[PDB]
């Protein structure tokens, strides 16, 4: 039997990116940068992607690594931007299936930093269609617009 | 309930508001039998009416 | 020796605070539920450490007191951090006939279950309807309409004692329920056979219950 | 025959001396009404890699 | 010593056991007791099967 | 087991009171010396204790502690009025720069009242009454009784301290911040409030 595997990884409107799909590979991925140049941002988003559950999500500083802290600020909402935001990963099943699994994410406007969530997924979506071009609309010269 | 539409139509012939007619019905009925005009029989075979 | 549990608090009480079972127990306790035979769980864990118990509640100026039917309660003191509160008349109605229920030899047979209908009979059938129904409407005269709503506030009320944990409605069906020895808290006024007036008088000295 | 006489007695005559039992009532969480939801909506554009 | 019976002739449980002298509640207890004893040790022979 | 510094905390003699007002939702800002400095103190541990009956106890960024409950709480929740929320925003408002030379932090019940009837629109006024209501006087008083009433209801909360005699005038904690905008790098302070209260 062929197992699953996961096929991409793409971050819409976050900090520092606004539209970006990383290729995963078959056995290792590797991120390289400086310090500050957005490695856990993307852990975060596609662990975000995986889980949901807001009571859950807790991203801690590699620094202070296992103790309960029950920090004010769980460290996600900083890591969005203004306006709508997406996180979607592509998946191709052992029955060779291509699905897109997702969430809306978004910015709740008053003194609390709560995000909103809302999970979605696409079946059947032709083997052409990428991510990044199907969660934007070109306006303009070269100019595209995120839409809701 | 056919004494509660007896006075329905009592207070339409008097044009009165439509406003609590169940309850001045109710008012009414207890009126009558406080005043001895009407016996009232309570049956627990009739399922309470 | 120094940083050690002895120091600040028993061992048992704090072991008693650790458990799982405890945060449950004492926000219901706090909200005024009595805890009776029948949830094992519970009334296990008050069993095993009743005496931590009333320790610590003592803290507060409540009691955690134990009745002769083996059923457990927070009575506060005047000087309480906890608020106290009073049961309405009409509760005690229905509370009274509850207790009559389940003594109740004659309808043993149920095996406790018992409908709000059968509730409702028995009441009409000891106090005086006619005076009672003063307390639905300072009107009423034997109307339907008027015994529809005195049966409704009875339905209600019944809820508010099944919340204070004195008996249980059926998993599927709610025109159904089943007593818990709790309610034998409404006899406190007559278990003893001596003068109504004295018995009163050591009730409210005890904080048990209060006039209106 | 004991309880009978001594309960049922008691139910009769509540009236000539009411009395009612007292219960723990500590008070609930007073917690913020929840406003409607409003999103921060921005209609964010940029060149796209 | 009317003090102490007095303390102890609320302290009565339930109905079969409402015998107002406290000394002659003893014995029902006791019987109670007994009778628990037997159901305990038929339950735990059905346990082991 | 459990922590020796838990058990520690929880055998104070302050704890009972502190833990029977947090449950009322009550605020703890820096004028209480002792109840603030014990929480200052044995917070990583209260935070875990409180965190078994999934409610959150949250110290705000200006300095105060409070409980906030999930979902799941174990602890019976309950809510403010419509009213409740107008009036705390009002105060909030009243937390202002020329408070200072105005009244040196002691303010009076027909402040507030005045406020609230100068700033708030007709219609919300008037839902907050009854919607059949119209501009009467008895409608006014009836709103002045309301406004006493949730007054109260606040002051239980810990934001507003009444001067200690029969005269309603009070003084505004900093814990009404609670009730507060969003702050966004230099944006005023009165302007987005006023924006929320429109
Ligand atoms: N919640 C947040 N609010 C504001 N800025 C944030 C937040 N989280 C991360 N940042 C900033 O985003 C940038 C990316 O941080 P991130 O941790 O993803 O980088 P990195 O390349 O993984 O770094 P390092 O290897 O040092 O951990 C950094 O400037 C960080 O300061
Ligand atoms: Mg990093």
């Keep these: 039997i062929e197992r699953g595997k996961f096929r991409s990884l793409t971050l819409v409107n976050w900090n520092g990116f606004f539209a970006r799909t990383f290729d995963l590979d078959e056995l290792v991925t590797t991120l390289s940068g400086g310090n500050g140049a957005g490695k856990s941002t993307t852990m975060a988003a596609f662990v975000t992607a995986l889980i949901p559950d807001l009571t859950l999500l807790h991203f801690r500083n590699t620094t202070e690594a296992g103790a309960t802290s029950g920090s004010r600020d769980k460290g996600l909402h900083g890591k969005l931007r203004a306006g709508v935001c997406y996180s979607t990963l592509d998946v191709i099943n052992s029955r060779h299936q291509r699905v897109v699994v997702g969430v809306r994410l978004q910015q709740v406007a008053g003194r609390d930093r709560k995000v909103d969530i809302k999970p979605f997924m696409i079946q059947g979506l032709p083997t052409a269609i990428q991510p990044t071009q199907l969660l934007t609309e070109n306006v303009g010269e070269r100019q595209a617009r995120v839409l809701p | 309930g056919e004494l509660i539409d007896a006075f329905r139509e009592v207070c339409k012939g008097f044009e009165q508001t439509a406003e609590s007619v169940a309850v001045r019905a109710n008012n009414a009925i207890n009126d009558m039998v406080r005043q001895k005009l009407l016996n009232r029989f309570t049956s627990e075979l009739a399922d309470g009416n | ?212 | 025959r004991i309880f009978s006489q001594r309960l049922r007695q008691s139910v009769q005559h509540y009236f000539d001396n009411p009395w009612t039992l007292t219960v723990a009532n500590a008070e609930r969480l007073l917690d913020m009404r929840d406003e409607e939801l409003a999103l921060r909506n921005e209609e964010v554009t940029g060149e796209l890699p | ?49």
Excluded: W
Excluded at chain 3, 113 to 129: H, P, R, V
């Design chain 3, 1 to 212: 020796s120094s940083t050690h549990i002895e120091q600040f608090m028993p061992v048992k009480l704090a072991q008693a605070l650790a458990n799982s079972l405890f945060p449950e127990l004492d926000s219901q306790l706090r909200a005024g539920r009595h805890i009776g035979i029948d949830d094992l769980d519970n009334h296990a864990f008050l069993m095993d450490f009743q005496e931590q118990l009333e320790e610590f509640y003592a803290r507060y100026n409540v009691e955690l007191i134990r009745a002769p039917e083996g059923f457990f309660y927070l009575r506060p003191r005047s000087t309480t951090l906890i608020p106290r509160s009073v049961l309405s008349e009409l509760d005690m109605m229905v509370g009274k006939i509850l207790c009559y229920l389940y003594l109740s030899p004659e309808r043993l047979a149920n095996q406790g279950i018992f409908t709000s209908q059968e509730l409702y009979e028995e009441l009409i059938s000891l106090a005086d309807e006619g005076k009672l129904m003063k307390f639905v409407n300072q009107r009423s005269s034997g109307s339907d309409l008027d015994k529809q709503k005195l049966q409704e506030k009875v339905r209600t009320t019944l809820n508010r004692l099944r919340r204070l944990g004195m008996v249980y409605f059926l998993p599927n069906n709610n025109n159904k329920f089943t007593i818990t020895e709790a309610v034998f808290r409404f006899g406190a006024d007559v278990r003893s056979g001596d003068d109504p007036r004295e018995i009163q008088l050591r009730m409210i000295r005890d904080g048990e219950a209060m006039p209106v």
């Design chain 5, 1 to 49: 010593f009317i003090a102490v019976y007095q303390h102890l002739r609320e302290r009565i449980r339930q109905d079969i056991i409402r015998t107002d002298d406290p000394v002659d509640a003893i014995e029902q207890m006791e019987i109670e007791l007994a009778r628990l004893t037997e159901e305990l040790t038929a339950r735990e022979q059905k346990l082991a099967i």
